[PDB]
Design an enzyme around this catalytic site. Structure first.
Site, PDB file in Angstrom:
ATOM      1  N   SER B 200     -70.661 100.512 -41.719  1.00  0.00           N
ATOM      2  CA  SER B 200     -71.808 100.854 -42.550  1.00  0.00           C
ATOM      3  C   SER B 200     -73.105 100.640 -41.774  1.00  0.00           C
ATOM      4  O   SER B 200     -73.326 101.272 -40.736  1.00  0.00           O
ATOM      5  CB  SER B 200     -71.800 100.035 -43.846  1.00  0.00           C
ATOM      6  OG  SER B 200     -72.668 100.604 -44.812  1.00  0.00           O
ATOM      7  N   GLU B 331     -65.983 108.368 -49.179  1.00  0.00           N
ATOM      8  CA  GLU B 331     -67.123 107.555 -48.765  1.00  0.00           C
ATOM      9  C   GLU B 331     -68.100 107.318 -49.907  1.00  0.00           C
ATOM     10  O   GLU B 331     -68.861 106.342 -49.880  1.00  0.00           O
ATOM     11  CB  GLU B 331     -67.843 108.218 -47.587  1.00  0.00           C
ATOM     12  CG  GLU B 331     -67.113 108.093 -46.268  1.00  0.00           C
ATOM     13  CD  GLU B 331     -67.297 106.731 -45.629  1.00  0.00           C
ATOM     14  OE1 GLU B 331     -68.190 105.983 -46.079  1.00  0.00           O
ATOM     15  OE2 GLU B 331     -66.556 106.407 -44.676  1.00  0.00           O
ATOM     16  N   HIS B 444     -65.676 103.122 -49.764  1.00  0.00           N
ATOM     17  CA  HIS B 444     -66.376 102.723 -48.550  1.00  0.00           C
ATOM     18  C   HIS B 444     -66.187 101.233 -48.291  1.00  0.00           C
ATOM     19  O   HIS B 444     -66.444 100.402 -49.167  1.00  0.00           O
ATOM     20  CB  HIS B 444     -67.862 103.060 -48.679  1.00  0.00           C
ATOM     21  CG  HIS B 444     -68.722 102.457 -47.614  1.00  0.00           C
ATOM     22  ND1 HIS B 444     -68.991 103.096 -46.424  1.00  0.00           N
ATOM     23  CD2 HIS B 444     -69.387 101.277 -47.567  1.00  0.00           C
ATOM     24  CE1 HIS B 444     -69.779 102.335 -45.686  1.00  0.00           C
ATOM     25  NE2 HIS B 444     -70.034 101.225 -46.356  1.00  0.00           N
TER      26      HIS B 444
END
Ligand SMILES: O/N=C/c1cc[n+](C[n+]2ccc(/C=N/O)cc2)cc1
Ligand SMILES: O/N=C/c1cc[n+](C[n+]2ccc(/C=N/O)cc2)cc1
Lengths: 540, 540
Positions: B200, B331, B444
């Site tokens: 991330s 995602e 995610h």
């Protein structure tokens, strides 16, 4: 001694604990069960009396706090955290607490019963500011405080059905009042001299027990601090209560997969969900669009309340009743930091003209666009229509008057004119230890420290004047509990507290100065909310 | 033995601790200070190196987490609270951790360096999913992870001034990389075989170190998981960074009323505020109007980043560099619950069409109405334009492609076409213990637990196939760290992982099935974001 920490009630035996005050010891019985735990198939249902137990229930510590939302607006802040749960959450939470003086009263002693506030969505009897050790030691009265179900667990209502009737959180308080009738004598208390006193949503509950016949017989006096049952936030209609309950069920996955949605299969689906899941979606059933609007509040089902609070107050006979009502100096400032644009506890909150016009919308919600303008007219100073400091205190008055002061004054005036003996106050002392910013003045809920004698705690940094002040307030509240009159029975030395009548509308200011009588609980502003605004809202 | 839990670095001596895995022990040195605590007048400033210390610093537990907002969307929920801080918060947080195999490597061993994610506003090296004991035991590499300042403390920027230069959180990571160059040899690590891998915002940080010449010389490979520096959320302009920093100062009362604030008097006022006060107003800096947009992120100042990440990636020479990039299958689903209307993790999130059009505005903010329409009409199945399940997956792709998948694919293509050797993957396994709802698929951040071999923990209910899958995944990551190639050096029987080229665009799917080569990282959708949307945005 330790023999007095042992008491038998109609359900069994209890062992309490001795609490220490700078003036003497007090016997406390914390955690007495008064109802069967409302878990599993008993969720959303009216409480049932606790079945008698074998052995000695430990009553030396507070029990669990009812499941509720935990405030996270200002993490680590004392001003908000002091109202957050200080025991672990559990649906097994229907427990009450009894403080009694040492030595135990030999003669029947008047009983004060506390009911907590928090919008019907939060609250607990275990908070440090509700500690009854100082009020009981100083005035030798019996103090009782119960836990009642809040949020969806206490006030989710599918009206008509018996699986989720609603107002079960009010029935929790009533059962605790029936428990006081049947068991307070064992603690030295007089079941014929019971004085209810609550704050915010607790005051709205106290008033809602006045308007309910089954609850009226369980007490004799009432004290409503910064709250009233007729407030715009304290009740909800049947159609809206059904919409919110159905919406909460949808957010947690009920009904699943498109099955039937009748109230039986919906509540059964809600009963299978963990308690925290229901809490995590409580503030979604509202548009928000919400300060001062709470998801699950008492409903006008026709059962607990045969009509709206305003209808029952206007048609009520209140002879033989004594009431003590009051508000704080700045009721609305506490609620502005919860969504009013431009407001923050960490700056001066000097709002603009446009922010004031928008703040009226969140403070007075579900209102017509033209009615919101009449609010701006009434609360604007037109010699200084742009002064941010004046606009800040103006929006504070808009929210405080509409939600607290004027619903209280409307109630207080109707009671005195229909037989009740009413005394009114306005709390105007800001604590020297208050962590909220200076511009909030005396915020909502910060008279409770002084009613419970918390300044007497030697571990807290209160001034010597606040200690004498707290002792004077405890005498006022105790005298009202004993005689129905806050004035000392044989003392003409101290200034007198005249009753509040619908005509003169007299009240006293509570601060470090001696009592001072005044006229009108925001008489000009409250005529706008109570008299004109309904005439305007009905013209559509 | 216990002599290997004692190591001397250039600052002093440390005592580590021995961690247990089901396959052997590991020597861990948790809490090594690499910088002077950035407190007092050093708040918002670049880090200074830790001064040498006398005696033996204890390195047996994780140090404090940097001050950061704590997520409270779903209290008590494992899926959200697994990313929350698990140590006390403090500005004294610049500490790193080193895992090393037992017995200690005698020859220089490749070093993996972990950078945690969390939108540059949260995260900590001490989270259980970042436990390097399983990767180090199974692959005999050296794992390093540091803490870096997040939020305002790491990325508040008044550009130009020296009191708040910005990007100090990126400089924290760089100082930890210089520390690895000077000290990882003492732990058996090779300072000439250092492989950064983040996730991330950590992946975005890894990419920004590739585009910063001073940071480029401290590592040799890069792994970017579900993040890239060129994302629409990872950078901010100087004008907006100044507007955001000034807004935060206003919310906390800076400058005081009756005073003007240059860059000096403003930062001086900010340095006097408690750290929690700054955190409590982090999310008011932007309209909100915000999922996927964070208040304080790396700024494009000309210092750390001479140009925008997009400009430096295009003009960059990447010969002699191996990169491993990838994304998860879904995602976008993790972020919908944070604000997209009609979305709730406790139901099916079967959104209407009106909620879909509104969600595009929240997931893709700051775009014109015509631009938002082009997104809706591109992501709508016109044979089923009202199917709620398809609209849910559509909005998940809208925010997943716009924020992660296409910034990664854009970056991955430019690298392979300009000298870099690139391998791409798509993680398609949903853990059997996942607490998020099924409709989120593979959310995610939920490949990290398999890269770190968390399924090997005997106190977790992972399946036998996930254990074999986790071991296979760590080998890919270790082989890339050692040789710059995830394929087994001498195992031709196992399916091969071909490099990602700008033309063929080959990647592999990581799940319980053997490797399968595919072409195109959402090639059709990412052409809409990378190629056309900028052209349409040239129309005001
Ligand atoms: O982004 N979400 C913000 C947010 C903030 C607060 N709540 C709950 N809430 C609302 C109103 C009040 C009023 N108290 O007087 C108390 C508690 C939900 C969501
Ligand atoms: O009571 N306050 C509630 C509240 C305060 C602040 N936010 C902003 N916010 C946006 C995105 C995220 C994570 N995105 O991945 C986290 C937090 C939401 C709710």
């Amino acid at each position: 001694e330790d023999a007095e920490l042992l008491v038998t009630v109609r359900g069994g035996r209890l062992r309490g604990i001795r609490l220490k005050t700078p003036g003497g010891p007090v016997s406390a019985f914390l955690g007495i069960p008064f109802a069967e735990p409302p878990m599993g198939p008993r969720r959303f249902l009216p409480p049932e009396p606790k079945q008698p137990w074998s052995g000695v229930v430990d009553a030396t510590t507070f029990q669990s706090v009812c499941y509720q939302y935990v405030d996270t607006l200002y993490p680590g802040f004392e001003g908000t955290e002091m109202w957050n749960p200080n025991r672990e959450l559990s649906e097994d939470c229907l427990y009450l607490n009894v403080w009694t003086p040492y030595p135990r009263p030999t003669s029947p002693t008047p009983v004060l019963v506390w009911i907590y506030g928090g919008g019907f969505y939060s609250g607990a009897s275990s908070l440090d500011v509700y500690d009854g050790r100082f009020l009981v030691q100083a005035e030798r009265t019996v103090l009782v405080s119960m836990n009642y179900r809040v949020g969806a667990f206490g006030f989710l209502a599918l009206p008509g059905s018996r699986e989720a009737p609603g107002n079960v959180g009010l029935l929790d308080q009533r059962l605790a009042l029936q428990w006081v009738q049947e068991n307070v004598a064992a603690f030295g208390g007089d079941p014929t001299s019971v004085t209810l006193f609550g704050e915010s949503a607790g005051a709205a509950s106290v008033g809602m027990h006045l308007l309910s016949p089954p609850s009226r017989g369980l007490f004799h006096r009432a004290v409503l601090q910064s709250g009233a049952p007729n407030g715009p936030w304290a009740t909800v209609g049947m159609g809206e209560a059904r919409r919110r309950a159905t919406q909460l069920a949808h957010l947690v996955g009920c009904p699943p997969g498109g099955t039937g949605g009748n109230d039986t299969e919906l509540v059964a689906c809600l009963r299978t969900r963990p308690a925290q899941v229901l809490v995590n979606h409580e503030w979604h059933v509202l548009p928000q669009e919400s300060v001062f609007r709470f998801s699950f509040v008492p409903v006008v089902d026709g059962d607990f309340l045969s009509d709206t609070p305003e209808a029952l107050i206007n048609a009520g006979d209140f002879h033989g009743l004594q009431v003590l009502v009051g508000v704080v100096k700045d009721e609305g400032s506490y609620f502005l930091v919860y969504g009013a644009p431009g407001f923050s506890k960490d700056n001066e909150s000097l709002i603009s003209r446009a922010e004031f016009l928008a703040g009226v919308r969140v403070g007075v919600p579900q209102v017509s666009d033209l009615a919101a303008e009449a609010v701006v007219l009434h609360y604007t100073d037109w010699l200084h229509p742009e002064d941010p400091a004046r606009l800040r205190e103006a929006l504070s008055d808009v929210v405080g008057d509409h939600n607290v002061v004027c619903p209280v004054a409307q109630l207080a005036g109707r009671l005195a004119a229909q037989g009740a003996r009413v005394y009114a106050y306005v709390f105007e002392h800001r604590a020297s230890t208050l962590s909220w910013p200076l511009w909030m003045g005396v915020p909502h809920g910060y008279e409770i420290e002084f009613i419970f004698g918390i300044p007497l705690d030697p571990s807290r940094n209160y001034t010597a004047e606040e200690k004498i002040f707290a002792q004077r307030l405890m005498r006022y509240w105790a005298n009202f509990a004993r005689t129905g009159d806050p004035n000392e029975p044989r003392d003409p030395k101290a200034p007198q507290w005249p009753p509040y009548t619908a005509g003169a509308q007299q009240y006293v200011s509570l601060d470090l100065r001696p009592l001072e009588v005044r006229r009108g609980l925001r008489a000009q502003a409250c005529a706008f909310w109570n008299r004109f605004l309904p005439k305007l809202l009905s013209a559509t």
